[PDB]
């Protein structure tokens, strides 16, 4: 109630700061996790207290049967358990001049994660639960970028966007697939 209030308004204030600054989206951290994952020989140990403390939202995608925690920052450890907001991009709170880049592995041995995200098409919906709020997004854009390209990961002025980012091609991962949704109203019909 007042915790999902206080938390949410800190996210919005950080989003306003980010929107007022020259952002360089932290692709380098995500890219380092992709490279470390390619050569990794060991699985991650769960620490649930840390995972809960790091959880800023739940991402739900009904078309692919996906529900994942969304974490506050980027580490190969967090990416074993969910998706990470790319450092230098918006908290997914909604509002104009927000662009949350939610990034995950296209599968790790332990967990499907964003394995089925590349099957998403224009018109497909996804949902964000964050503090005292449910947000609806509709997919309108699919693009492949170079892993170093940050242009498409910046805040688009006057737009309310969430991009789902993973790797492509499958089992090569030289590139990033961006699936971008735009805010739409959340309605009674979306709960059920």
mmCIF file with all atom_site columns, C-alpha atoms in Angstrom, residues 70-150:
data_model
loop_
_atom_site.group_PDB
_atom_site.id
_atom_site.type_symbol
_atom_site.label_atom_id
_atom_site.label_alt_id
_atom_site.label_comp_id
_atom_site.label_asym_id
_atom_site.label_entity_id
_atom_site.label_seq_id
_atom_site.pdbx_PDB_ins_code
_atom_site.Cartn_x
_atom_site.Cartn_y
_atom_site.Cartn_z
_atom_site.occupancy
_atom_site.B_iso_or_equiv
_atom_site.pdbx_formal_charge
_atom_site.auth_seq_id
_atom_site.auth_comp_id
_atom_site.auth_asym_id
_atom_site.auth_atom_id
_atom_site.pdbx_PDB_model_num
ATOM 1  C CA . UNK A 1 70  ? 12.122 -7.887  -13.355 1.00 0.00 ? 70  UNK A CA 1
ATOM 2  C CA . UNK A 1 71  ? 15.265 -6.829  -11.425 1.00 0.00 ? 71  UNK A CA 1
ATOM 3  C CA . UNK A 1 72  ? 16.540 -3.278  -10.675 1.00 0.00 ? 72  UNK A CA 1
ATOM 4  C CA . UNK A 1 73  ? 19.978 -3.825  -12.328 1.00 0.00 ? 73  UNK A CA 1
ATOM 5  C CA . UNK A 1 74  ? 22.102 -6.185  -14.473 1.00 0.00 ? 74  UNK A CA 1
ATOM 6  C CA . UNK A 1 75  ? 24.301 -9.133  -13.396 1.00 0.00 ? 75  UNK A CA 1
ATOM 7  C CA . UNK A 1 76  ? 24.799 -12.621 -14.886 1.00 0.00 ? 76  UNK A CA 1
ATOM 8  C CA . UNK A 1 77  ? 23.574 -13.908 -11.438 1.00 0.00 ? 77  UNK A CA 1
ATOM 9  C CA . UNK A 1 78  ? 20.193 -12.000 -11.590 1.00 0.00 ? 78  UNK A CA 1
ATOM 10 C CA . UNK A 1 79  ? 19.793 -13.068 -15.295 1.00 0.00 ? 79  UNK A CA 1
ATOM 11 C CA . UNK A 1 80  ? 19.698 -16.758 -14.127 1.00 0.00 ? 80  UNK A CA 1
ATOM 12 C CA . UNK A 1 81  ? 16.395 -15.983 -12.277 1.00 0.00 ? 81  UNK A CA 1
ATOM 13 C CA . UNK A 1 82  ? 14.580 -13.348 -14.369 1.00 0.00 ? 82  UNK A CA 1
ATOM 14 C CA . UNK A 1 83  ? 14.967 -10.261 -16.556 1.00 0.00 ? 83  UNK A CA 1
ATOM 15 C CA . UNK A 1 84  ? 16.979 -7.113  -15.728 1.00 0.00 ? 84  UNK A CA 1
ATOM 16 C CA . UNK A 1 85  ? 16.231 -3.467  -16.509 1.00 0.00 ? 85  UNK A CA 1
ATOM 17 C CA . UNK A 1 86  ? 19.235 -2.247  -18.569 1.00 0.00 ? 86  UNK A CA 1
ATOM 18 C CA . UNK A 1 87  ? 21.264 0.308   -16.469 1.00 0.00 ? 87  UNK A CA 1
ATOM 19 C CA . UNK A 1 88  ? 20.580 3.829   -17.867 1.00 0.00 ? 88  UNK A CA 1
ATOM 20 C CA . UNK A 1 89  ? 16.986 2.960   -19.036 1.00 0.00 ? 89  UNK A CA 1
ATOM 21 C CA . UNK A 1 90  ? 13.613 3.769   -17.297 1.00 0.00 ? 90  UNK A CA 1
ATOM 22 C CA . UNK A 1 91  ? 12.012 1.831   -14.457 1.00 0.00 ? 91  UNK A CA 1
ATOM 23 C CA . UNK A 1 92  ? 8.846  0.421   -16.130 1.00 0.00 ? 92  UNK A CA 1
ATOM 24 C CA . UNK A 1 93  ? 6.438  2.733   -14.188 1.00 0.00 ? 93  UNK A CA 1
ATOM 25 C CA . UNK A 1 94  ? 4.670  4.078   -17.324 1.00 0.00 ? 94  UNK A CA 1
ATOM 26 C CA . UNK A 1 95  ? 4.467  7.786   -18.296 1.00 0.00 ? 95  UNK A CA 1
ATOM 27 C CA . UNK A 1 96  ? 5.709  9.833   -21.289 1.00 0.00 ? 96  UNK A CA 1
ATOM 28 C CA . UNK A 1 97  ? 9.565  10.031  -21.696 1.00 0.00 ? 97  UNK A CA 1
ATOM 29 C CA . UNK A 1 98  ? 9.946  6.485   -20.249 1.00 0.00 ? 98  UNK A CA 1
ATOM 30 C CA . UNK A 1 99  ? 11.632 3.614   -22.162 1.00 0.00 ? 99  UNK A CA 1
ATOM 31 C CA . UNK A 1 100 ? 12.379 0.564   -19.959 1.00 0.00 ? 100 UNK A CA 1
ATOM 32 C CA . UNK A 1 101 ? 14.687 -1.977  -21.672 1.00 0.00 ? 101 UNK A CA 1
ATOM 33 C CA . UNK A 1 102 ? 13.913 -5.332  -19.979 1.00 0.00 ? 102 UNK A CA 1
ATOM 34 C CA . UNK A 1 103 ? 16.678 -7.807  -20.960 1.00 0.00 ? 103 UNK A CA 1
ATOM 35 C CA . UNK A 1 104 ? 16.960 -11.604 -20.430 1.00 0.00 ? 104 UNK A CA 1
ATOM 36 C CA . UNK A 1 105 ? 18.835 -14.655 -21.753 1.00 0.00 ? 105 UNK A CA 1
ATOM 37 C CA . UNK A 1 106 ? 17.187 -16.527 -24.585 1.00 0.00 ? 106 UNK A CA 1
ATOM 38 C CA . UNK A 1 107 ? 17.056 -19.488 -22.112 1.00 0.00 ? 107 UNK A CA 1
ATOM 39 C CA . UNK A 1 108 ? 19.660 -20.813 -19.645 1.00 0.00 ? 108 UNK A CA 1
ATOM 40 C CA . UNK A 1 109 ? 19.872 -24.581 -18.916 1.00 0.00 ? 109 UNK A CA 1
ATOM 41 C CA . UNK A 1 110 ? 17.827 -23.953 -15.682 1.00 0.00 ? 110 UNK A CA 1
ATOM 42 C CA . UNK A 1 111 ? 15.050 -21.630 -17.051 1.00 0.00 ? 111 UNK A CA 1
ATOM 43 C CA . UNK A 1 112 ? 13.272 -20.647 -20.315 1.00 0.00 ? 112 UNK A CA 1
ATOM 44 C CA . UNK A 1 113 ? 13.406 -16.858 -19.515 1.00 0.00 ? 113 UNK A CA 1
ATOM 45 C CA . UNK A 1 114 ? 13.081 -15.065 -22.978 1.00 0.00 ? 114 UNK A CA 1
ATOM 46 C CA . UNK A 1 115 ? 13.297 -18.367 -25.001 1.00 0.00 ? 115 UNK A CA 1
ATOM 47 C CA . UNK A 1 116 ? 9.785  -17.690 -26.548 1.00 0.00 ? 116 UNK A CA 1
ATOM 48 C CA . UNK A 1 117 ? 9.960  -13.815 -26.707 1.00 0.00 ? 117 UNK A CA 1
ATOM 49 C CA . UNK A 1 118 ? 11.120 -13.912 -30.400 1.00 0.00 ? 118 UNK A CA 1
ATOM 50 C CA . UNK A 1 119 ? 7.718  -15.540 -31.308 1.00 0.00 ? 119 UNK A CA 1
ATOM 51 C CA . UNK A 1 120 ? 5.946  -12.253 -30.309 1.00 0.00 ? 120 UNK A CA 1
ATOM 52 C CA . UNK A 1 121 ? 4.267  -10.286 -33.181 1.00 0.00 ? 121 UNK A CA 1
ATOM 53 C CA . UNK A 1 122 ? 2.690  -6.803  -33.666 1.00 0.00 ? 122 UNK A CA 1
ATOM 54 C CA . UNK A 1 123 ? -0.613 -6.619  -31.679 1.00 0.00 ? 123 UNK A CA 1
ATOM 55 C CA . UNK A 1 124 ? 0.569  -9.040  -28.929 1.00 0.00 ? 124 UNK A CA 1
ATOM 56 C CA . UNK A 1 125 ? 0.246  -7.606  -25.374 1.00 0.00 ? 125 UNK A CA 1
ATOM 57 C CA . UNK A 1 126 ? 2.400  -7.773  -22.238 1.00 0.00 ? 126 UNK A CA 1
ATOM 58 C CA . UNK A 1 127 ? 1.760  -6.580  -18.678 1.00 0.00 ? 127 UNK A CA 1
ATOM 59 C CA . UNK A 1 128 ? 3.883  -4.964  -15.918 1.00 0.00 ? 128 UNK A CA 1
ATOM 60 C CA . UNK A 1 129 ? 2.903  -5.178  -12.206 1.00 0.00 ? 129 UNK A CA 1
ATOM 61 C CA . UNK A 1 130 ? 5.007  -2.504  -10.351 1.00 0.00 ? 130 UNK A CA 1
ATOM 62 C CA . UNK A 1 131 ? 4.202  -1.145  -6.860  1.00 0.00 ? 131 UNK A CA 1
ATOM 63 C CA . UNK A 1 132 ? 0.457  -0.209  -6.782  1.00 0.00 ? 132 UNK A CA 1
ATOM 64 C CA . UNK A 1 133 ? -0.030 -0.362  -10.611 1.00 0.00 ? 133 UNK A CA 1
ATOM 65 C CA . UNK A 1 134 ? -0.791 -2.729  -13.547 1.00 0.00 ? 134 UNK A CA 1
ATOM 66 C CA . UNK A 1 135 ? 0.331  -1.469  -17.022 1.00 0.00 ? 135 UNK A CA 1
ATOM 67 C CA . UNK A 1 136 ? -0.599 -2.837  -20.494 1.00 0.00 ? 136 UNK A CA 1
ATOM 68 C CA . UNK A 1 137 ? 1.795  -2.649  -23.510 1.00 0.00 ? 137 UNK A CA 1
ATOM 69 C CA . UNK A 1 138 ? 1.021  -3.590  -27.142 1.00 0.00 ? 138 UNK A CA 1
ATOM 70 C CA . UNK A 1 139 ? 3.917  -4.776  -29.426 1.00 0.00 ? 139 UNK A CA 1
ATOM 71 C CA . UNK A 1 140 ? 4.269  -2.516  -32.537 1.00 0.00 ? 140 UNK A CA 1
ATOM 72 C CA . UNK A 1 141 ? 7.992  -2.993  -33.498 1.00 0.00 ? 141 UNK A CA 1
ATOM 73 C CA . UNK A 1 142 ? 10.565 -5.840  -33.896 1.00 0.00 ? 142 UNK A CA 1
ATOM 74 C CA . UNK A 1 143 ? 14.187 -4.929  -34.795 1.00 0.00 ? 143 UNK A CA 1
ATOM 75 C CA . UNK A 1 144 ? 17.628 -6.550  -34.827 1.00 0.00 ? 144 UNK A CA 1
ATOM 76 C CA . UNK A 1 145 ? 20.505 -4.260  -33.687 1.00 0.00 ? 145 UNK A CA 1
ATOM 77 C CA . UNK A 1 146 ? 24.292 -4.643  -33.198 1.00 0.00 ? 146 UNK A CA 1
ATOM 78 C CA . UNK A 1 147 ? 25.052 -5.374  -29.492 1.00 0.00 ? 147 UNK A CA 1
ATOM 79 C CA . UNK A 1 148 ? 26.971 -1.997  -29.273 1.00 0.00 ? 148 UNK A CA 1
ATOM 80 C CA . UNK A 1 149 ? 24.049 0.061   -30.759 1.00 0.00 ? 149 UNK A CA 1
ATOM 81 C CA . UNK A 1 150 ? 22.408 2.134   -27.916 1.00 0.00 ? 150 UNK A CA 1
#
